[PDB]
């Protein structure tokens, strides 16, 4: 049986531009803030002119983080492989000023760090750790002028012992709890965007491994600090005017005996001239919904996209023109009917299912990897390179070989090239870091971040739809 050989057809996608200050387009997020500035610099009074910063560190870590933020916000030089940091003062870089008030500084005293050794097991010890870290977020949230930003400079001995606690809890089985997911959820009920800053970053010596060069440690910290205090660093240019990008991702229940997979939402839409806004998961799924398989059933499919359109007709006041549901898993026929019967109020839809692949990986005979933006089609398999060598910077700022992003499933009114053009510009919107691009789109990266924190929310607390609290 002479099998028909697969035809390998290929094309490359042009790199999108991001709208920086004065609506000036530039490719790299690092270089577009140095020349022009952040996007919200002239957009109005949304630009944070003064940022008030609090600390929940101990005595040594607060001083180390303060001298790091004073020797890091005034310009950091970089080599040829790391573009320099301009600064975070009122005349350099982001054109915003850091201000360390001494009234908004909590402090982990030594009588309390040793109070979390008295409980016997590992459950109550971690619970008391989350208890005082919640209490000293409360004491900052109840001041008459709460800080705009809270930097938890956690000590090393607390993170080493209570940062990752796994135990057995009778009816739940092996339970793994994390400190970071338990204090970004306690800072969300008090409305305080926080930033955990360990001693490996603030005390890092030059020419030392396991951390970046100080230019990238400046960039990835202060881009997140600029977004978390209000204002937007950059917005893309080549995107539609009515799309309602949804980023559904599945997540296990908390425990090794509870079998089930709940969902995580991420709306990514456009509000007037402000650019992309990232909303998601105003609610918590009821404990009786679940879903035995990895995918989702039909009443959940009808409720979920109904709440998606409810979020769209509350901030844009219109029905969405397009709804593009990115998802990690494939589309079963149970959930394909329910994302289509309940999308009858929307003109066009695009049920898209992407996932990085395992063994198939294109290579090149040169010394540098195959580029970012390729669209290799091995017959029916479609492989998109959201990571690779980038022609704008002429460098590969990663290691090993990039994984392809396999398009596992597609059904909708758009083509394959059109939605894989929109996916590559949705890739570049990770405001957590000042990197050029990542693997997954921000719809599937924010909703791997919201469902991991929904595992550490005590039910009655309603979660907040911002990208600030989940970053």
């Amino acid at each position: 049986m002479k099998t028909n050989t697969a035809t390998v057809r290929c094309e490359l996608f042009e790199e999108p531009s991001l709208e920086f200050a004065s609506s000036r387009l530039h490719l790299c997020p690092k270089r577009g803030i140095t020349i022009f500035g952040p996007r919200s610099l002239d957009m109005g009074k949304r630009h944070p002119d003064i940022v008030r910063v609090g600390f929940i560190g101990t005595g040594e870590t607060i001083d180390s983080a303060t001298r790091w933020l004073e020797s890091c916000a005034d310009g950091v030089e970089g080599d040829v492989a790391n573009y320099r940091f301009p600064g975070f003062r009122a005349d350099r870089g982001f054109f915003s000023d850091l201000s360390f008030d001494a009234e908004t500084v909590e402090r982990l005293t030594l009588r309390e760090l040793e109070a979390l050794a008295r409980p016997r097991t590992k459950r109550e010890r971690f619970e008391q750790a989350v208890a005082l870290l919640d209490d000293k977020l409360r004491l900052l949230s109840q001041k008459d002028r709460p800080p705009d930003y809270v930097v938890l400079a956690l000590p090393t001995e607390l993170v080493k012992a209570q940062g990752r606690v796994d135990y057995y809890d009778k009816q739940d089985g092996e339970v793994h709890r994390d400190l970071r997911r338990a204090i970004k959820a306690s800072a969300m009920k008090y409305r305080l965007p926080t930033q955990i800053l360990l001693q490996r970053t603030t005390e890092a010596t030059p020419g030392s491994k396991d951390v970046d060069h100080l230019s990238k440690c400046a960039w990835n910290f202060f881009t997140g600090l600029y977004y978390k205090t209000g204002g937007v660093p950059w917005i893309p240019a080549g995107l539609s005017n009515g799309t309602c990008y949804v980023g559904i991702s599945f997540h296990q229940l908390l425990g090794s005996k509870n079998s089930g997979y709940f969902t995580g939402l991420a709306q990514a839409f456009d509000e007037q001239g402000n650019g992309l806004v990232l909303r998601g998961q105003d609610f918590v799924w009821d404990v009786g919904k679940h879903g035995n398989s990895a995918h989702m059933p039909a009443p959940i499919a009808e409720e979920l996209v109904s709440r998606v359109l409810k979020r769209y007709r509350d901030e844009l006041k219109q029905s969405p023109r397009r709804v593009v549901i990115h998802k990690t898993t494939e589309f079963w026929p149970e959930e394909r009917a329910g994302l289509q019967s309940a999308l009858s109020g929307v003109d066009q839809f695009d049920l898209v299912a992407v996932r990085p692949t395992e063994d198939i990986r294109l290579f090149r005979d040169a010394r540098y990897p195959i580029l970012r933006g390729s669209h290799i089609s091995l017959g029916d398999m479609h492989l998109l390179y959201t990571t690779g060598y980038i022609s704008a910077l002429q460098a590969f700022p990663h290691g090993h070989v990039p994984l392809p992003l396999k398009l596992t499933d597609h059904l909708g009114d758009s083509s394959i090239s059109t939605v894989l053009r929109e996916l590559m510009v949705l890739t570049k919107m990770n405001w957590n870091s000042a990197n050029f691009g990542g693997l997954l789109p921000i719809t599937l990266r924010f909703s791997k971040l919201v469902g991991e924190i929904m595992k550490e929310i005590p039910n009655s607390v309603d979660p907040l739809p911002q990208f600030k609290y989940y970053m």
Binding site: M1, K2, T3, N4, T5, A6, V8, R9, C10, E11, L12, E358, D359, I360, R361, L362, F363, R364, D365, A366, R367, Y368, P369, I370, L371, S374, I376, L378, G379, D380, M381, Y389, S391, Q394, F396, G399, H400, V401
Partner: protein, 273 residues
């Protein structure tokens, strides 16, 4: 973006130019912990005998329908139905039995090559023939040039010292893919398996460090050489990875699926094709 240069890219999959197209069912079978009296090892040793026992059958490729069969003259005398690939292609359950027979087929192909299977991560790793000694294999390329690579080496420490007390066995991640209605692919994934002193694996945490320390500086020229080395090891010359069953053939054409893409050029590389 100053000029467009056409390059040729190389994937890590091998096309399957010929497939077994008759799955001869065996619907009378003594269960799995008896099957050793297949006997009947052919005069042509090029014939391979895969088999599975699913639902009281003996699904195989060895032409079990007639009397003189290479497989199971006692277990399945003449009862067969000759199920085809064409009627099975629309059934998701029966395109799983076929690719599992193909997985056992390539497992039996890598038996003369002496690649041991881990049977847990689908990993065919080398091991040395004699304990305490290194294994370095000599292979013939497609173009005729003969080379030799260490595959079970124990690295001596760089500062003129004792060896680093972990053996770096070189492994492969073969898998089968459907690339069309009838287009197929054979994917090669290079890997490493790290042992203590040979023949005894490392733990779950130290292997994660020792594979990340090695496969982080293995950029897009020292992974392509491993893929080329693996197609040359599975080739052993005669550039078609072939397998015979008796009036059926599984022939893997060992040329990596190439293409041609036009992009703005990269300074300093200038790939020499």
């Amino acid at each position: 973006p100053e000029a467009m240069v056409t390059e040729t890219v190389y994937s890590n999959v091998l096309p399957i130019t010929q497939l077994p197209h008759y799955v001869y069912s065996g619907p009378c079978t003594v269960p799995e912990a008896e099957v050793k009296t297949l006997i009947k090892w052919p005069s042509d040793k090029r014939i391979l005998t895969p088999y599975i026992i699913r639902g009281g059958r003996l699904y195989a490729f060895n032409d079990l329908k007639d009397y003189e069969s290479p497989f199971a003259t006692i277990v399945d005398p003449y009862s067969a139905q000759r199920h085809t690939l064409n009627e099975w292609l629309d059934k998701p359950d029966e395109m799983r039995w076929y690719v599992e027979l193909l997985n056992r087929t390539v497992n039996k192909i890598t038996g003369h090559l002496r690649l041991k299977l881990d049977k847990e991560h689908h990993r065919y790793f080398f091991e040395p023939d004699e304990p305490g000694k290194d294994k370095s294999v000599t292979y013939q390329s497609v173009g005729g040039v003969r080379s030799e690579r260490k595959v079970a080496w124990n690295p001596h420490f760089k500062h003129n010292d004792m060896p680093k007390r972990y053996w770096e066995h070189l492994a492969v991640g073969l898998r089968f893919h459907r690339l069309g209605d009838m287009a197929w692919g054979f994917a090669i994934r290079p890997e490493r398996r790290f042992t203590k002193d040979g023949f005894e694996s490392l733990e779950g945490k130290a292997t994660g460090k020792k594979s990340t320390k090695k496969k982080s500086r293995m950029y897009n020229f020292d992974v392509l050489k491993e893929v080329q080395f693996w197609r040359d090891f599975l080739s052993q010359g005669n550039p078609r990875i072939t397998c015979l069953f008796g009036k059926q053939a599984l022939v893997i054409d060992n040329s990596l699926m190439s293409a041609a893409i036009t992009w703005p050029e990269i300074s300093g590389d200038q790939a020499n094709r």
